[PDB]
Amino acid sequence: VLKEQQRIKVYIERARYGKVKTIIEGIDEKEFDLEEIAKKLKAKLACGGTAKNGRIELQGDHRDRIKKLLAELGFSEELIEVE
Numbered sequence: 728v729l730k731e732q733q734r735i736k737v738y739i740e741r742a743r744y745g746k747v748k749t750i751i752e753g754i755d756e757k758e759f760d761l762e763e764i765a766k767k768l769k770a771k772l773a774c775g776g777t778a779k780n781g782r783i784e785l786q787g788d789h790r791d792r793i794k795k796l797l798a799e800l801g802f803s804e805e806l807i808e809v810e
């Protein structure tokens with residue numbers, strides 16, 4: 728059984744003009760290149776976004792697809808909490 732918390736958190740923050748953004752927090756920024764992971768997810772979703780301050784930010788609400796997309800990048804789906 729899993730011996731850690733649901734350490735990759737995915738949640739929504741407000742953007743302007745009635746839009747929203749998806750935040751992915753908890754990917755180890757020391758070990759992995761969050762800029763690169765952001766670029767990959769941006770390309771898969773054709774959306775804007777950035778990596779900053781230890782988090783990835785994506786334009787729009789991508790909670791519907793984020794577990795599949797992070798699993799395409801090898802992340803364990805049990806570590807991912809979509810909030």
Ligand SMILES: O=N[O-]
Pocket residue numbers: 741742743744745
């Ligand atoms: O972020 N302004 O909704």
